[PDB]
Amino acid sequence: TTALVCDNGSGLVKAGFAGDDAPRAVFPSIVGRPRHQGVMVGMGQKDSYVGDEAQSKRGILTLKYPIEHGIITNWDDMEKIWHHTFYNELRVAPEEHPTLLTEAPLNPKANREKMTQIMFETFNVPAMYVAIQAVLSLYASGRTTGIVLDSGDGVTHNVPIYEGYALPHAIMRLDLAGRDLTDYLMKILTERGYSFVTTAEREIVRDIKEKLCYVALDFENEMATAASSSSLEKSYELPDGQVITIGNERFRCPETLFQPSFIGMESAGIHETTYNSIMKCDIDIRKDLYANNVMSGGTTMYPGIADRMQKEITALAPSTMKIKIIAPPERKYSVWIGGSILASLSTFQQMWITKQEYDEAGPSIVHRKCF
Amino acid sequence: KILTERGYSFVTTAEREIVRDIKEKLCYVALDFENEMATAASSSSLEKSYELPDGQVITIGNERFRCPETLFQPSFIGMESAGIHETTYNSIMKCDIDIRKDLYANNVMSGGTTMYPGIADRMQKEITALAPSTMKIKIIAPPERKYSVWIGGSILASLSTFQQMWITKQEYDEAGPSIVHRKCF
Amino acid sequence: TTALVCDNGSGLVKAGFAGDDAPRAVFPSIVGRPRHQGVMVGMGQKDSYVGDEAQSKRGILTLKYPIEHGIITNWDDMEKIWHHTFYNELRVAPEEHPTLLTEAPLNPKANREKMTQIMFETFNVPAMYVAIQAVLSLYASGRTTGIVLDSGDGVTHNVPIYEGYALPHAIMRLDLAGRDLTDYLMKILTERGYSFVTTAEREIVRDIKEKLCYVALDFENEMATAASSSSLEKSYELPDGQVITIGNERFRCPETLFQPSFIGMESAGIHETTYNSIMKCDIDIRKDLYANNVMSGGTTMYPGIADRMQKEITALAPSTMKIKIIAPPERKYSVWIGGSILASLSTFQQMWITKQEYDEAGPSIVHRKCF
Amino acid sequence: LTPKKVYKPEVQLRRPNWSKFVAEDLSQDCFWTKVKEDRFENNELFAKLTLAFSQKKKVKELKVLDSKTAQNLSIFLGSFRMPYQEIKNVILEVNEAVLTESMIQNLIKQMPEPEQLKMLSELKEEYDDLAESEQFGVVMGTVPRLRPRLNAILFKLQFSEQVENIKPEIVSVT
Amino acid sequence: AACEELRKSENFSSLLELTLLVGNYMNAGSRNAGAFGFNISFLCKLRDTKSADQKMTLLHFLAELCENDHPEVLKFPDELAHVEKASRVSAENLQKSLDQMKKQIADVERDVQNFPAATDEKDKFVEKMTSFVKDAQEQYNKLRMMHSNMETLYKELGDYFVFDPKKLSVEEFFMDLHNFRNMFLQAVKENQKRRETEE
Ligand SMILES: Nc1ncnc2c1ncn2[C@@H]1O[C@H](COP(=O)(O)OP(=O)(O)O)[C@@H](O)[C@H]1O
Ligand SMILES: Nc1ncnc2c1ncn2[C@@H]1O[C@H](COP(=O)(O)OP(=O)(O)O)[C@@H](O)[C@H]1O
Ligand SMILES: [Mg+2]
Ligand SMILES: [Mg+2]
């Protein structure tokens, strides 16, 4: 039987089959509800719109994210996301197809418990697995050793692996990713005059961030360049036809990833997080983590981030070590591609959490069987 | 008020039907008000004649397009409100920002007061001047728009799904004459 | 040299000297223009009337508000407001008196640019400063810590401050205040047969809202009581002599402050805004913020709002917290009173933005110097 | 072609910073090759271009109090703006309508030492010449035995708030 | 229509010589000393060049100089008529739409030829759809000849203005020239107001 990989990220659900190269169904994880009064009777008036339909009719909908910082808050909304991504996107029956899910490290355990219980009682499977995203990213990079910075839409985590042995005391989680960048861009877009308050306008500011934003190599020189001349300014067309023009806010929005104190967080940026995750490891393997800095996630999809990361780690590391940022062009879907490796591996077939094991051991086998 | 400029007096309620017939038959909406006023002031080409039921003949000039200009300019009759094109633009701009591209393509006009044969091009010019230039300004003005509201009632009363939304005698006798607020819009 | 405090609110300009308890010149910010054909020659027929004169002759005037939601749109009309509030009300020369101004948080920066430019070029003061209204309200309360909900005619903002240290990532702005309540009362007065469409009638509906309206402690029990018996109904005399009588619209008008979905806004009420601004803060200051809910602004001048605010915050907070809504009786002018504090402090004298610093650095020092 | 006139003004002038076009980028039939702007040259124009486009007394003598005590008192006195003997009377009368928790808690926190308050009480004859923070310490220094009296003032003003907190908790359990 | 309208040039000659002579004296000793020319879209920023007393601008000083010395340069912005109606872009995807039109008509014309005989009297496919392809190929060749006339007139203006088809953003070219028209009318009216105030 062919398997399913369903990366339930905070922003974008990426679901599809096993053995494929690209994910079949990429759609954002929002649940929309109508907030006005319907006057036309009938017309297929649904009480809820899930996914890209909620992207389409978004001017009359309140959009709720079921996932915040890797932790599923609303569980009926997550059931609606899973029902949509099984029955509408893929059009599959989960009773005859295995499923691998991805999970951030340092997650609360009851999230995994309710994920296992919904996947075994509501959408009950022959088998399923819950894995760590950084192991799948290092699978898709094609190497055995390396440190992975995975930054989705809620969770930025650094996990180092040497020779297939992960070090659990060096795992570093930071709750700063693209949704906080979207909220900070909504905060700083009001400086120029453009106001975005609703949940519908969050998608517009997210589209502005996806199309126009980039990581600056030097923040002070780019701020002096944007203050001096209007060469870095770019224009964008809104859905109502109005045209906006933004300047330094193209690079101030991803600069929260290297300076969290803009949004009031005490913790350091991603480069010192990666450097402290390197320095928490044992002393022999650090050189083998210095040359294999694998990036993944959509938030590392800016076209300035690899050279900035190389500059900051080269500033932090000793000078006699080679810093090599592994940045593949397909790093956005890469965790899914790692699942398409790991579902296809012949040695993984004994590592399924079967239904008989769940019915024997309760919902307690998921802690001792997984990581 | 303005037909007393040329020597024709209409003060009774019987005469309001005659002035309403003059407004229904001869009046039209100018595309540009200043150019049409200069054209009517220059040459006697826009002047038309109407026959009163006693047998007298009246002749009117610029009053064919000064009477429906008050819809696009309420300050003729002393009102602080803006015109119908700016009211339509403000009702579009009060909506959410995602849906406006549909609404600029779907201006729907109804009622007999939009039955003048110059109103759609003037409305398109005013909304096209107000909207940004990347928007397709479409105005749907069917020729049967005088009774179309009634036709929409004949749409709604013949619907199979409208059979559950009636306010019956028993619900009226239960809740008094106050259930029509909670049941309807 | 005696300083000046000029709170340019959205609805009412409050200007006066420093060192004084009560504001000297409180007048609404409207610019009137005649819309009818003047037939009597001579007689001093001005083309514009500013302030209380525009209130006096309002039957033959179109009244324009130059400020909408804290953002000054018409700037020549705002120059007429400032020329009237300096030369006619206060009767002062602006070039020999410093003038602090107030500003809503999360304002567009070009408003501050043009405000600084007109305050340094047209009415060329020796020095000025632009501050935040909620810090002035926490000055006038007498305390140091606390969260301030300032609700004027355009802007309702929540700002938390602990020990003189604000948290700018928890400042929450909502564009729902007394002009939206006046327009909602103009919408719901048409149910009883009374029509109010012009801008002259908006002053009458605003006066009805100021005299008769109040905040219900519970909305549903008050609605059932007003639906049952006509005991809550009150009468009011129009200037033409007609007597109106209103029932539940006394408490349906400020209930939009606790339920914004009456006017089609997606965001939550002011109590949920205060609770989310408290929960956005750090944890160890939160017990100090629950006990110091300071309210200011005229929109918090209803005679039911402190008990409703205490009930809603105590419903939202955990039960072992002492909720204390600080509602002084002089909270309508209290922001100005805080300006009378801050202009009179001895340590504030080094914090003026001078004329020479403006001429050195352009109109760009107001972002770097102010908060 | 010829190069342009390299002017050397005496005074450095404010300028617009455009992106210029050099003579390498000029074409044969461009506008800038046919520019004859030296007919517009005038020394009065350059003269007009050169001409156009070129009490408080706040120190305070602090005889007894230090710098930090005098600063934080006058901040709170500017925050409160009552006359000093009126503050003395409301403390002595215990006027519970006027008195609050945050008024009293700011008073205790910014209160000076009793040795400083006794030293301010020894110089009551020079009351008008003292600072505004030092004027408040004279009037607060009019009551002696500072730390026993102020704690008795503290408990009495807290007693009404303590009774209004403790008593509805007991009734809710009962 | 706009390619047929665009046949005229020059107009602005006199103010650009006056601005460059004044501006080279201001930029002397800087990077921009001895500039042979400057951008026409930079003319909005003449108002940003303020004086020492910040009462008149360089836009106000050039308007006051033209009011005193040469009272014929001030009739320039009334000549600018089609400057406001020159701010748009419509190119590129017309070729991709017509190639999609040519592909889809040939897909229809292939399947009309490959259809079998009509077995029912209600099957009115064959009569009307052959008339559709006769209508569509007539309408596409009207579009293809007009697009070739569009491409020839665009190539004729390429020889006329001696430019290769790369230069675009003409909407930012003429918005600044239209804004300079409104700024110069404001500066003349402010200088006439300042002269009437001093009287
Ligand atoms: N090309 C891009 N440039 C910048 N940011 C991007 C780009 N593509 C995606 N993003 C950001 O990354 C996020 C998607 O990353 P992903 O790992 O797919 O999130 P999730 O899996 O949690 O939905 C989006 O929220 C978006 O804000
Ligand atoms: N007694 C009252 N009850 C309710 N609302 C009031 C009352 N008095 C004034 N208001 C409202 O307060 C507004 C004035 O607030 P203002 O002091 O101008 O705040 P800001 O300066 O922040 O705009 C008016 O628009 C009015 O609607
Ligand atoms: Mg992910
Ligand atoms: Mg205010």
Side-chain angles (χ1 to χ4, degrees):
Chain A
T1 74
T2 64
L4 310 172
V5 188
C6 178
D7 184 23
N8 287 125
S10 294
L12 280 76
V13 179
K14 287 163 275 297
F17 298 104
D20 281 315
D21 292 331
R24 182 61 55 94
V26 181
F27 74 103
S29 176
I30 61 170
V31 173
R33 281 186 195 84
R35 73 194 191 86
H36 285 129
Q37 203 179 130
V39 290
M40 291 198 172
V41 62
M43 74 162 283
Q45 269 161 358
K46 298 178 189 176
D47 57 339
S48 52
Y49 302 101
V50 187
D52 283 332
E53 201 180 8
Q55 280 284 106
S56 81
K57 292 187 193 290
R58 74 190 174 196
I60 61 170
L61 301 182
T62 292
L63 316 170
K64 297 295 191 194
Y65 283 91
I67 301 168
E68 286 180 356
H69 313 79
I71 300 168
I72 295 155
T73 68
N74 202 301
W75 283 104
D76 305 336
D77 302 358
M78 199 71 211
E79 280 186 7
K80 289 162 66 54
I81 300 299
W82 277 326
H83 190 276
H84 190 66
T85 195
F86 281 140
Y87 287 86
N88 287 117
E89 293 283 309
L90 264 68
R91 299 153 178 84
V92 290
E95 287 84 1
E96 57 196 18
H97 278 295
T99 303
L100 197 145
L101 307 173
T102 79
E103 199 193 8
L106 307 182
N107 205 326
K109 295 286 186 184
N111 201 73
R112 202 183 276 197
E113 293 274 325
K114 284 201 77 60
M115 266 164 67
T116 300
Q117 193 169 80
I118 288 160
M119 278 284 149
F120 267 109
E121 278 171 17
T122 310
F123 316 108
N124 62 6
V125 289
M128 58 94 73
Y129 194 81
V130 182
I132 311 299
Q133 320 193 325
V135 183
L136 309 178
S137 288
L138 210 56
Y139 281 150
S141 177
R143 59 195 76 250
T144 313
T145 183
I147 190 167
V148 184
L149 187 153
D150 178 87
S151 189
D153 202 38
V155 166
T156 302
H157 60 265
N158 275 282
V159 172
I161 290 156
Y162 184 79
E163 292 288 324
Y165 289 94
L167 282 72
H169 68 273
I171 294 170
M172 291 200 83
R173 169 165 178 162
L174 168 58
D175 296 348
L176 198 147
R179 199 181 301 183
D180 303 337
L181 308 186
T182 300
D183 292 354
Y184 186 64
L185 192 54
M186 269 155 65
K187 183 169 171 286
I188 67 185
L189 267 168
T190 62
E191 301 177 354
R192 266 173 173 275
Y194 319 118
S195 169
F196 298 96
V197 297
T198 67
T199 54
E201 289 156 339
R202 304 187 77 193
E203 312 304 305
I204 297 164
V205 176
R206 190 190 55 82
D207 208 61
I208 286 154
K209 193 196 83 201
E210 275 185 20
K211 280 182 168 60
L212 264 64
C213 285
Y214 74 105
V215 165
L217 186 66
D218 194 285
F219 180 64
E220 293 290 319
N221 293 337
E222 273 280 320
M223 274 283 276
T225 307
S228 83
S229 78
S230 71
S231 58
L232 300 163
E233 301 200 339
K234 281 281 188 189
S235 293
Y236 180 78
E237 182 168 353
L238 265 71
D240 62 344
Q242 295 167 19
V243 183
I244 56 170
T245 302
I246 59 177
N248 51 357
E249 293 98 345
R250 300 210 291 151
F251 50 87
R252 268 166 58 198
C253 171
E255 213 76 38
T256 314
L257 293 156
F258 302 102
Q259 277 150 31
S261 61
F262 288 158
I263 60 157
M265 292 195 76
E266 200 193 356
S267 50
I270 53 168
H271 58 277
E272 292 179 353
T273 313
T274 307
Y275 173 65
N276 286 320
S277 187
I278 284 157
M279 286 288 279
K280 261 187 170 61
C281 292
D282 305 352
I283 199 162
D284 304 299
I285 71 171
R286 290 184 206 169
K287 166 173 133 63
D288 287 21
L289 301 179
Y290 272 141
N292 293 267
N293 283 84
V294 172
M295 279 194 308
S296 68
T299 318
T300 61
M301 279 287 294
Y302 292 109
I305 198 169
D307 307 66
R308 178 61 180 279
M309 193 87 86
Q310 186 166 1
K311 184 201 163 188
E312 288 293 326
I313 290 169
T314 306
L316 283 169
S319 46
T320 75
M321 291 298 157
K322 309 297 172 54
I323 308 303
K324 199 193 183 102
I325 313 298
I326 304 301
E330 53 267 21
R331 61 180 172 274
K332 192 147 67 181
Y333 304 125
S334 77
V335 187
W336 190 92
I337 295 153
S340 288
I341 289 153
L342 190 58
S344 301
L345 272 172
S346 62
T347 54
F348 195 70
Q349 310 307 299
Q350 69 194 2
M351 288 183 67
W352 288 116
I353 301 163
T354 65
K355 199 170 146 55
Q356 194 184 349
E357 287 174 14
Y358 180 77
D359 293 320
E360 195 261 2
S364 306
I365 205 156
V366 65
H367 305 312
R368 81 198 74 164
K369 189 68 178 292
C370 302
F371 180 71
Chain B
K1 184 169 170 285
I2 66 178
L3 267 171
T4 59
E5 281 185 355
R6 283 170 170 276
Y8 316 127
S9 179
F10 298 104
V11 298
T12 72
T13 69
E15 286 158 334
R16 192 175 281 122
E17 310 303 307
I18 312 180
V19 178
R20 193 189 47 82
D21 200 75
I22 286 154
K23 189 201 82 187
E24 275 180 6
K25 282 185 166 59
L26 266 67
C27 284
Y28 75 105
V29 166
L31 185 66
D32 195 284
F33 182 62
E34 305 293 323
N35 288 312
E36 278 275 312
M37 276 287 276
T39 308
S42 76
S43 71
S44 73
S45 64
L46 298 163
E47 303 204 337
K48 291 282 180 193
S49 291
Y50 184 77
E51 181 160 353
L52 260 59
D54 67 330
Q56 290 181 22
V57 176
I58 58 160
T59 318
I60 51 169
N62 53 349
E63 300 104 338
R64 305 207 299 149
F65 58 92
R66 286 171 65 198
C67 170
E69 207 74 33
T70 317
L71 292 158
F72 296 98
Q73 200 168 2
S75 49
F76 290 159
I77 57 164
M79 280 191 72
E80 209 167 317
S81 53
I84 50 174
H85 61 273
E86 288 184 355
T87 315
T88 312
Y89 174 65
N90 289 323
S91 174
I92 285 156
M93 283 290 286
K94 267 187 163 64
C95 293
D96 282 321
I97 207 161
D98 287 297
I99 70 173
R100 292 181 199 166
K101 191 169 128 63
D102 285 15
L103 297 174
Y104 280 127
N106 290 268
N107 285 101
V108 176
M109 292 196 305
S110 66
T113 316
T114 72
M115 275 295 299
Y116 296 110
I119 193 161
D121 309 333
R122 174 59 179 280
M123 191 76 83
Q124 190 164 0
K125 191 178 86 73
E126 287 292 327
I127 292 168
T128 300
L130 285 164
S133 48
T134 54
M135 316 306 289
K136 311 294 174 55
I137 306 304
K138 271 158 66 175
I139 291 162
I140 298 103
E144 52 262 27
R145 65 183 164 276
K146 201 152 67 175
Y147 314 121
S148 67
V149 183
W150 185 90
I151 289 157
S154 294
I155 292 162
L156 185 55
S158 305
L159 270 175
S160 50
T161 69
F162 207 66
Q163 305 301 310
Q164 59 173 358
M165 287 195 73
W166 299 99
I167 297 167
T168 66
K169 183 61 175 173
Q170 303 95 15
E171 299 168 69
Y172 168 75
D173 295 326
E174 192 265 323
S178 53
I179 199 166
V180 65
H181 311 319
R182 71 183 77 119
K183 199 75 178 294
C184 311
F185 182 75
Chain C
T1 309
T2 304
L4 299 173
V5 187
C6 177
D7 191 7
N8 280 118
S10 301
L12 279 81
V13 172
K14 297 157 278 290
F17 290 92
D20 294 332
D21 300 328
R24 196 82 67 81
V26 182
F27 70 101
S29 185
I30 43 169
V31 171
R33 276 184 178 85
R35 67 190 183 88
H36 285 123
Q37 186 171 7
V39 294
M40 288 210 163
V41 74
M43 73 163 285
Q45 270 165 355
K46 293 184 182 175
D47 56 343
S48 73
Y49 304 97
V50 184
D52 286 331
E53 206 178 3
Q55 279 290 109
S56 76
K57 301 191 198 300
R58 75 193 184 200
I60 49 168
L61 295 179
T62 301
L63 310 173
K64 295 286 186 192
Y65 279 93
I67 309 184
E68 291 179 9
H69 315 128
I71 301 157
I72 294 155
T73 76
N74 200 296
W75 284 100
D76 301 329
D77 292 5
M78 201 73 217
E79 270 194 12
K80 288 163 66 56
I81 300 299
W82 282 350
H83 179 269
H84 184 73
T85 199
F86 283 169
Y87 286 90
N88 292 121
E89 298 289 312
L90 262 65
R91 299 173 179 83
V92 298
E95 59 261 19
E96 57 192 20
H97 272 289
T99 304
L100 190 138
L101 303 179
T102 62
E103 202 191 10
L106 308 182
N107 207 334
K109 296 288 196 71
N111 186 65
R112 212 183 269 195
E113 290 277 323
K114 280 197 73 57
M115 266 166 66
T116 300
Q117 204 196 112
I118 293 157
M119 275 283 147
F120 272 112
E121 281 178 347
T122 318
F123 323 106
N124 61 6
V125 303
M128 69 99 75
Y129 188 86
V130 184
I132 306 300
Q133 311 184 337
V135 192
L136 305 177
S137 295
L138 213 49
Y139 283 149
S141 188
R143 64 200 71 222
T144 312
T145 187
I147 190 167
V148 183
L149 188 153
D150 180 86
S151 190
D153 195 51
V155 166
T156 299
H157 59 267
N158 274 280
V159 171
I161 287 153
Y162 179 77
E163 292 288 324
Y165 287 86
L167 282 72
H169 67 278
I171 292 169
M172 294 200 81
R173 167 166 174 163
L174 171 59
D175 287 338
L176 188 153
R179 203 179 299 180
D180 284 316
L181 306 183
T182 312
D183 289 1
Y184 186 57
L185 191 57
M186 273 167 75
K187 185 173 175 286
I188 66 180
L189 268 169
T190 60
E191 295 180 345
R192 279 177 168 277
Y194 319 122
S195 178
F196 297 105
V197 285
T198 68
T199 61
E201 285 159 335
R202 189 172 286 149
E203 310 302 307
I204 310 179
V205 177
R206 191 193 50 80
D207 191 73
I208 285 153
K209 191 195 83 198
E210 282 187 2
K211 291 287 184 296
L212 265 63
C213 284
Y214 76 105
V215 163
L217 186 64
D218 195 284
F219 181 57
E220 294 290 323
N221 270 310
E222 275 272 318
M223 273 283 266
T225 318
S228 89
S229 63
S230 71
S231 68
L232 298 159
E233 293 200 338
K234 292 283 179 196
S235 292
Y236 183 80
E237 180 174 348
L238 261 55
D240 77 317
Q242 295 176 29
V243 193
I244 59 164
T245 300
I246 50 168
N248 54 349
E249 295 100 337
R250 300 213 290 146
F251 53 88
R252 287 174 66 195
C253 178
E255 208 76 33
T256 318
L257 295 150
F258 305 105
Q259 285 166 32
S261 53
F262 284 168
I263 58 164
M265 281 189 71
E266 199 174 327
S267 58
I270 53 169
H271 62 282
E272 284 185 47
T273 311
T274 313
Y275 174 66
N276 289 335
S277 178
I278 282 156
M279 286 289 283
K280 265 183 167 60
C281 286
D282 297 330
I283 190 167
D284 281 294
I285 77 177
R286 280 184 205 165
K287 189 172 122 65
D288 293 24
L289 295 177
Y290 277 131
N292 292 268
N293 296 114
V294 180
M295 291 199 306
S296 74
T299 311
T300 66
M301 274 290 293
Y302 291 103
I305 198 167
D307 308 331
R308 179 61 183 279
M309 192 78 95
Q310 181 159 346
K311 184 198 161 188
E312 285 292 328
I313 290 168
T314 318
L316 286 165
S319 49
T320 64
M321 315 306 288
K322 303 293 174 55
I323 309 304
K324 184 171 190 87
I325 316 296
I326 305 298
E330 56 266 20
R331 62 181 168 277
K332 200 150 69 174
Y333 311 123
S334 78
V335 183
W336 186 90
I337 291 157
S340 311
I341 290 159
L342 189 57
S344 312
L345 275 170
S346 60
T347 68
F348 195 71
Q349 310 305 305
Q350 68 192 359
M351 283 178 66
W352 291 117
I353 296 167
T354 63
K355 183 69 171 69
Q356 197 186 345
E357 282 172 14
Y358 176 78
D359 298 322
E360 203 272 323
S364 298
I365 204 173
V366 76
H367 308 323
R368 300 189 276 99
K369 194 71 71 63
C370 305
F371 156 70
Chain D
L1 298 171
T2 47
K4 291 289 195 189
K5 201 162 183 181
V6 188
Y7 293 105
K8 288 179 182 178
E10 304 183 341
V11 193
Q12 184 63 72
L13 309 179
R14 303 189 183 183
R15 62 222 180 199
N17 308 312
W18 63 76
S19 307
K20 68 179 183 178
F21 301 122
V22 291
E24 287 87 3
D25 290 315
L26 301 177
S27 77
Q28 188 165 319
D29 307 330
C30 85
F31 170 64
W32 308 111
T33 42
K34 293 154 188 172
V35 161
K36 297 190 176 182
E37 62 185 0
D38 60 304
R39 75 203 168 101
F40 291 102
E41 200 172 57
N42 195 6
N43 288 318
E44 206 187 328
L45 165 60
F46 299 141
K48 284 164 178 163
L49 197 62
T50 311
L51 192 140
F53 291 89
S54 56
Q55 63 274 331
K56 209 73 178 286
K57 180 69 178 43
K58 284 300 295 180
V59 289
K60 283 279 146 183
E61 173 54 51
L62 305 173
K63 296 174 180 165
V64 177
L65 303 177
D66 65 275
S67 69
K68 197 189 172 195
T69 315
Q71 180 168 12
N72 295 349
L73 274 164
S74 305
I75 282 156
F76 169 66
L77 284 168
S79 306
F80 194 65
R81 298 186 153 197
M82 203 163 280
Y84 306 125
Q85 204 81 4
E86 188 174 328
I87 297 159
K88 162 167 169 190
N89 289 331
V90 175
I91 280 157
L92 281 164
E93 287 155 17
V94 192
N95 215 330
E96 290 169 64
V98 180
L99 280 152
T100 48
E101 183 178 1
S102 195
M103 167 185 173
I104 285 297
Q105 276 177 356
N106 280 292
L107 274 162
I108 284 151
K109 184 171 172 176
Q110 313 279 38
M111 197 64 65
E113 298 296 315
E115 289 87 30
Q116 293 169 314
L117 287 159
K118 198 203 180 214
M119 277 190 288
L120 279 158
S121 86
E122 285 167 11
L123 282 72
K124 284 172 191 119
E125 305 298 312
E126 306 184 287
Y127 176 71
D128 290 316
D129 287 306
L130 289 164
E132 286 174 19
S133 50
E134 285 196 303
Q135 275 168 333
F136 182 63
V138 165
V139 178
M140 289 293 110
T142 53
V143 297
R145 185 177 178 179
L146 277 296
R147 296 309 158 140
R149 201 178 301 221
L150 280 160
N151 294 349
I153 283 155
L154 167 58
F155 175 59
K156 177 161 171 40
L157 287 155
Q158 280 182 328
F159 183 72
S160 54
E161 204 172 345
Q162 274 158 16
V163 162
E164 281 163 1
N165 287 297
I166 284 155
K167 204 168 185 179
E169 293 185 325
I170 300 170
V171 164
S172 300
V173 175
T174 312
Chain E
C3 281
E4 282 181 53
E5 282 175 352
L6 186 64
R7 275 289 152 177
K8 189 46 176 54
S9 67
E10 200 60 23
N11 278 139
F12 46 93
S13 278
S14 298
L15 191 78
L16 287 172
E17 294 186 352
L18 192 63
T19 312
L20 191 70
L21 183 88
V22 167
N24 273 331
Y25 200 84
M26 286 153 106
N27 274 282
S30 189
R31 190 179 166 179
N32 302 359
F36 277 83
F38 77 108
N39 200 1
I40 191 170
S41 68
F42 199 79
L43 284 165
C44 295
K45 292 136 187 158
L46 293 193
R47 201 174 60 174
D48 303 336
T49 313
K50 294 186 184 179
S51 58
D53 61 335
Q54 303 202 46
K55 298 201 202 97
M56 59 186 77
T57 66
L58 181 53
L59 184 74
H60 283 103
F61 186 74
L62 279 159
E64 199 155 26
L65 193 77
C66 284
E67 275 177 307
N68 293 318
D69 292 359
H70 279 225
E72 60 185 0
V73 176
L74 299 165
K75 287 160 189 169
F76 89 96
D78 299 327
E79 294 160 14
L80 305 170
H82 279 74
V83 163
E84 206 177 359
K85 207 271 188 188
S87 295
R88 58 103 171 179
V89 54
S90 167
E92 201 257 334
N93 58 4
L94 281 163
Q95 185 58 48
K96 279 173 178 164
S97 311
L98 281 162
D99 286 320
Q100 200 198 303
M101 188 174 277
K102 195 194 177 190
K103 193 207 168 190
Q104 280 173 287
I105 282 161
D107 286 343
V108 175
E109 198 187 358
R110 200 189 302 115
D111 298 327
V112 159
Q113 283 156 5
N114 285 266
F115 201 70
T119 44
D120 210 308
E121 293 191 343
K122 289 173 164 181
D123 200 338
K124 301 296 204 173
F125 166 75
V126 176
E127 186 195 308
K128 291 150 173 169
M129 275 283 288
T130 300
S131 190
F132 166 68
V133 170
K134 195 182 173 186
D135 179 44
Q137 197 68 65
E138 195 186 313
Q139 281 193 41
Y140 169 65
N141 286 342
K142 282 164 185 165
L143 284 174
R144 201 174 189 274
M145 196 191 295
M146 279 164 65
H147 191 272
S148 299
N149 181 72
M150 192 217 78
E151 280 178 279
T152 318
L153 274 160
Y154 187 57
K155 204 203 170 265
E156 270 173 15
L157 283 184
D159 300 320
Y160 191 70
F161 279 89
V162 74
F163 85 113
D164 62 357
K166 294 181 176 67
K167 162 195 92 191
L168 206 60
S169 178
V170 75
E171 54 263 22
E172 298 182 356
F173 190 86
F174 279 104
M175 180 48 84
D176 282 315
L177 191 55
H178 162 68
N179 281 314
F180 180 56
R181 166 180 99 182
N182 293 351
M183 265 179 233
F184 208 94
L185 282 161
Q186 186 64 35
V188 169
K189 280 163 187 168
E190 271 185 35
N191 283 339
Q192 284 170 11
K193 194 172 180 181
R194 203 193 88 208
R195 281 201 303 237
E196 277 186 52
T197 310
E198 284 168 7
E199 188 177 5

